[PDB]
Amino acid sequence: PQITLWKRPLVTIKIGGQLKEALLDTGADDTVLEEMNLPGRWKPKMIGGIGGFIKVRQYDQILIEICGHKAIGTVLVGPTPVNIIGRNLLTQIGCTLNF
């Protein structure tokens, strides 16, 4: 689809068999989701945003479906203010900016 930006670009995602709402965030290198239980191993990492750095759990090679488009990649889980889909997954679904 072509998504205009007068509203937040929010979409439904499916991860770990659960549906959630997430923000398509071209300003994020990485995908960061709010606290949740994910299966598999994870390593502690740190990521920085506009307000500083936070501790996150890094899950590698996680299956995640975005508007019916499948992606498999790194998902960070931690105290982000909102679920964000970053470029590591936006590229996998073929997302581009156009103007």
Ligand X SMILES: CCC(CC)CN(C[C@@H](O)[C@H](Cc1ccccc1)NC(=O)O[C@H]1CO[C@H]2OCC[C@H]21)S(=O)(=O)c1ccc(OC)cc1
Run of H or E including 24: strand 18-24
Piece of the chain touching a second copy by CB under 8 A; list 13-21, 27-35, 36-44, 57-65: 27-35
Q: Which does 97 bind (CB under 5 to 8 A by kind): ligand X, a second copy, none?
A: a second copy
Does the footprint of ligand X cover residue 86 (CB under 6 A)? Answer: yes
Q: If DSSP codes are grouped into helix, strand and coil, which group holds residue 78?
A: coil
**What's the rounded Cα separation, in Å, for the pair 55 and 77?**
9
Among 17, 19, 50, 61, binds a second copy (CB under 8 A): 50
- Measured at the CA of 30, the angle between CA 29 and CA 35, to 5 degrees, comes to 150
Does the footprint of ligand X cover residue 49 (CB under 6 A)? Answer: yes
Catalytic residue selected from 25, 29, 30, 60: 25
**What's the rounded Cα separation, in Å, for the pair 63 and 60?**
9
Q: Which residues bind a second copy (CB under 8 A)?
A: 1-6, 8-9, 23-29, 32, 47-54, 67, 69, 80-82, 84, 87, 90-91, 93-99
